[PDB]
Structures are given as structure tokens and as C-alpha cells.
Design a protein around this nucleic acid. Structure first.
Length: 547
DNA sequence: ATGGGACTTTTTGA
DNA sequence: TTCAAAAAGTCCCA
């Protein structure tokens, strides 16, 4: 709410060092370092200390090369505050605190400080900057105001579109006002590396700057008590012909960031893996994996001839708009007031397992089948109407498109009331299950059914067998969107792009999947046999894919 | 009190 | 008319 977030000191030190470790202060004693979202100035104070050390270490060389009277130890503070440090923020209080801190670093002429309290995306910047650091704000499409979103769409259409984020626009602004040959280094969410909304931002970054380094923390909790996954991006505008990116990807997401005094020590250690990515070979997606994973992914992609999107029709669950008004326990007495034709089985993401779905515990009132208010007054007055006001605040109800008691997005009943495959929208592993009970679900579970023309080619049992294998788990996680610790996004924009194969092992894989399903559906389950069959199927799939 | 695991709504642009 | 993406997630407990 306040917009002020405490970046860890080690991250700030690493970013400042990355920007300013190889700066020739003799050649250019007037470097412009800008923090576009400084806030309390965690980055700017470190920049001040680094610059003070740099000027003090080379004070006599500057005295020789330039005006000897101007370059004195006493005058370093004034020079840094006048020509070096620039900060911008939207909070007056934080800017005041930062100005006080910069003043207290060292009456006189009341040295001026280049601190601005305004919107960095609206400010007209007179000059470009040698170096840019800081941590931009992260605000999604839900928490962003409508008029500001219109402004972003009009002015930042190159990177902001649909469900994009504000830090996309901040990336664009940082790139735009970066001096030629300058270096920028920021910490942002890692989602733009793989999200669908980030495609335009990725294209802009690829085509406008050379990405020096990507540090991916995956699901590690960099910010305490904050539910976000972070990455560090360092880029330049220098004239270079190599265009190779160092990628440091974390291997253990439970590590403590204070293991060493410096972040580079952590990167060098066994807690991180390093590899190189050719920027010129980047596609719409950024496949930031090592050589072994790249070979694995390429083999799977080249071997497979079909994809899930080609052979299946996919859809999202029902979005009622107020779950408490339409979802009831199956053992609720109020369900006695609702006819069984209006009741549908309701499942959550946790109910989805491998090859099977847990028994339904909830019922959904498909209120779209209620013709009018008069005939079914009991249900509306005693069940749904308890949240009527909230139901009236939905967008479609305010515009009159939807009645107050109707589901906001009821989809089509025929899609759910058939044999299909369901999977949770967020999970730690591949969980694709055949639904035999015509289960309905919210958007936390996605569903798909095979097209008629591909039924003779692919069966549900074979699909769930291959998709739940460790091979396909690893294959999907190569390009999957990492959300948090042990959580990947399983959405149609990437699930439907999974490629599938068909060869001489189809029959045995289908038989093993059928055996696993039969064991799982039995009243008494011996799961060890299921694990053994899964191992056999994994071996068979690896044999099929030549890996 | 914080840290970490189980679990996941509906607002929103298109 | 109506699809689907979006964690500065959210809540609970030791």
C-alpha cells in the first residue's frame, strides 16, 4: 500500500557493484546514476559511498588532469550531490528522508540534490543517464487504476498490453533514457521471462539492449513476507558483437540469501548453476536452460508430430463471481431447497490427482437454468440473495448483461458434462486426470477434451499416461512459468503447446495407464505397484523419445 | 512473533 | 457475447 519495499542489502550492493565496478572515473568524472523508484534510497546511499571511495582514491589524478582547485577531498560530497546522484519517487515522505540522509552524509551554499517527487513514467527527462539502478514497483492488472491503465496503453503500447504489469513500462522507460554505452541493473519479478504478457517486453529488451546477465532466483523468497519471485537483470547499450548472456539459475529454492557476505560468492558456489545463452538465437520465448536440458527439449520437440492444441479443445472452469453464493457443501440442509437438476459436482485444484479425481465434496448451483425470480423464490431469497449486494457489484450485473442471481461466466454445460481431462492451474508437478463424473470446477482447474477426428489416434488413458510421466514433467517444466516455491503455472497458453508422439509403444503405455487407473480406483490401493508401473512407463517413454 | 507449507478468487482486457 | 490471464499471492499454524 505504501509502495516502499526493503530490498536486501546484499542485492543492493551486488547491483551497485555490477553497475559501477569498471567505471573509469579519470576519463569521465561526471557519471549520472539514476534510481527511478528510489523510495527511501537504499540504492542511492550505496552509490554515494561507492562514488566517494572512487573520487577519494583518484583525487590527485583528477587534480593533475583537471582544475586542481575544484578537485579536493572536501569538494567530493558537493560534486557527487550536484552531478552524479539522481532519484525519482512518488512518495514525498520517502524523498524527504532520502534528501535528509544525503545531506547528513557530510552554513554553505545549501547544495542542491536532484531528487524528484513525481511519476517517473510521466516525467519528461531532459537528459539520459550513464547508469540506472533500483527496484521498480510491481502492480498487476487488478490493483492498477483504470485511467492509469488507459494512459499506459496509450503511451506504453510497445510493452504494456492486456494483462501486463507496471514494471514492463518501467523497463521500457529505463531502456529509453539509458545513455549510449551505459549500464542498467534492476531487480524485478521473474515472471516476464516466461509469461505470455511479457512477450512484447522480451522483444523490446532483446532488440534495444544487450542483456549482460540474468540472475534467476526461481521460487526463493528474496523479500521477507512478500509473495513474489524475483530476478536480477543487467543490460548495457555498448557496441558489442558477441551478444551472449550469463544466466545464473538457483538450484535450491530453500537457500538463505545471507550465506556469504557478497552475492557473487553465492553465485560462484554450488547453490547456483551458470550457463551462456546466445541473445541472437532468442525466440519469442526465452529458453534459459543448460546444454543438457536444451538437447532434451529439442529432441522432444523434434520427435513429436502433434500437440495438445492440435488434437484437443481446452477451456477454463466456471467463474461464478461469488463462490460463497453458489457453492455449497454436499451435506448442506439448504441444498434440500434446490432441485437436483440445478446441482453440479464441484471440485477444487487439490482434488486433482494423477489419473483420477477425488470424490466431490461440493455442489454448484447452476443458477443460469433458473428462468425467473418468481418461480424459484425460495432459492434466491434463502441461498443466493444472502450475497445479492456483492453479486450486484459484478461488472456484467451493473451493465445489465447478467442477472444478479446468474453466474458471471457459466461457460457451456455440455463441455463439463462429458469425459475429459482436468489439471490444476497451479501445481508442483504434472497432474492430469480423467474425469468420469462430469465434475465442474472454477478457474483453478483447466479442462480439455479430445477432438472427434483424433479419438481414433489418441485416447484419454494414453494421454494421461504420457503427461503424468517424469519425462513430460521435466519437459513441461523447461518452459513453464515458475510462480513461487514448488509452484508452476499450468495454464492453456503453455499446456496446450505440449507436443505429443505416437509410435509402437502406444499400446503398452495405454495398458500401463489403464492398470494404474484400475488400481487407483479400487477401494483398497497398493500404491507401490502403481509406482512400479509408473517407472516402467517412464522407461518406455524414454525409449520412445530416444533419451 | 515470523517462517514456511497447503492452497487458490474474480477482476479484467480483449 | 464471452473467452482466458493474472501472484510485491492469501491464509493458517508452529
Amino acid at each position: 500500500a505504501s509502495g516502499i519495499y526493503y530490498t536486501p542489502k546484499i542485492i543492493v550492493d551486488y547491483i551497485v557493484k555490477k553497475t559501477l565496478k569498471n567505471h573509469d572515473i579519470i576519463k569521465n568524472p561526471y557519471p549520472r546514476i539514476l534510481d527511478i523508484s528510489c523510495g527511501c534510497g537504499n540504492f542511492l546511499l550505496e552509490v554515494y559511498d561507492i562514488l566517494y571511495d572512487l573520487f577519494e582514491e583518484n583525487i590527485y589524478e583528477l587534480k593533475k588532469k583537471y582544475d586542481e582547485n575544484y578537485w579536493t577531498v572536501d569538494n567530493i560530497h558537493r560534486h557527487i550531490l550536484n552531478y552524479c546522484i539522481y532519484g525519482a519517487d512518488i512518495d514525498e515522505k520517502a524523498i524527504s528522508i532520502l534528501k535528509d540522509s544525503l545531506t547528513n552524509k557530510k552554513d554553505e551554499s545549501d547544495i542542491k540534490i536532484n531528487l524528484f517527487c513525481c511519476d517517473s513514467l510521466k516525467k519528461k527527462w531532459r537528459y539520459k543517464f550513464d547508469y540506472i539502478v533500483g527496484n521498480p514497483p510491481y502492480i498487476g492488472h487488478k490493483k492498477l487504476e483504470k485511467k492509469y491503465k488507459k494512459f499506459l496503453l496509450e503511451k506504453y503500447s510497445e510493452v504494456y498490453k492486456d494483462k501486463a504489469d507496471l514494471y514492463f513500462c518501467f523497463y521500457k522507460k529505463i531502456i529509453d533514457i539509458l545513455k549510449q554505452g551505459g549500464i542498467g541493473s534492476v531487480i524485478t519479478p521473474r515472471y516476464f521471462l516466461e509469461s505470455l504478457s511479457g512477450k512484447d517486453l522480451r522483444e523490446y529488451i532483446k532488440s534495444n539492449v544487450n542483456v549482460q546477465e540474468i540472475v534467476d532466483f526461481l521460487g526463493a523468497n528474496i523479500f521477507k513476507n512478500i509473495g513474489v519471485s524475483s530476478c536480477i537483470l543487467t543490460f548495457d547499450k555498448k557496441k558489442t558483437k558477441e551478444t551472449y548472456i550469463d544466466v545464473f539459475k538457483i538450484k535450491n529454492e530453500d537457500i538463505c540469501i545471507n550465506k556469504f557476505e557478497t552475492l557473487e560468492e553465492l553465485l560462484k558456489s554450488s547453490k547456483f548453476e551458470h550457463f551462456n545463452i546466445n541473445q541472437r538465437l532468442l525466440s519469442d520465448e526465452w529458453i534459459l536452460v543448460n546444454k543438457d536440458d536444451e538437447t532434451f527439449y529439442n529432441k522432444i520437440q523434434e520427435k513429436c508430430k502433434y500437440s495438445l492444441e492440435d488434437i484437443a479443445i481446452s477451456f477454463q472452469g466456471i467463474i461464478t463471481g461469488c463462490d460463497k453464493a453458489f457453492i455449497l457443501s454436499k451435506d448442506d440442509v439448504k441444498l434440500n431447497l434446490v432441485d437436483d437438476k440445478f446441482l453440479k459436482c464441484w471440485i477444487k485444484s487439490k482434488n486433482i490427482n494423477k489419473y483420477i479425481v477425488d470424490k466431490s465434496e461440493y455442489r454448484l448451483i447452476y443458477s443460469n437454468d433458473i428462468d425467473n425470480e418468481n418461480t424459484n423464490k425460495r432459492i434466491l431469497d434463502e441461498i443466493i440473495g444472502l450475497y445479492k449486494t456483492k453479486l450486484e457489484n459484478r461488472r456484467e450485473c451493473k451493465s445489465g448483461i447478467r442477472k444478479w442471481y446468474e453466474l458471471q461466466w457459466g461457460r457451456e454445460k455440455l463441455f463439463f458434462e462429458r469425459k475429459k481431462i482436468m489439471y490444476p492451474y497451479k501445481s508442483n508437478e504434472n497432474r492430469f486426470a480423467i474425469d468420469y463424473d462430469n465434475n465442474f470446477s472454477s478457474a483453478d482447474v483447466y479442462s480439455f477434451f479430445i477432438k472427434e477426428e483424433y479419438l481414433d489416434k489418441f485416447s484419454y488413458e494414453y494421454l494421461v499416461g504420457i503427461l503424468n510421466s517424469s519425462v513430460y514433467d521435466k519437459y513441461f517444466k523447461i518452459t513453464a512459468k515458475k510462480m513461487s516455491k514448488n509452484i508452476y503455472d499450468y495454464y492453456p497458453n503453455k499446456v496446450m503447446k505440449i507436443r505429443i508422439f505416437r509410435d509402437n509403444n502406444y499400446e503398452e503405455i495405454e495398458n500401463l495407464s489403464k492398470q494404474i487407473i484400475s488400481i487407483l480406483l479400487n477401494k483398497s490401493i497398493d500404491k507401490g505397484k502403481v509406482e512400479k508401473l509408473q517407472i516402467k512407463m517412464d522407461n518406455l517413454i524414454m525409449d520412445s523419445l530416444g533419451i
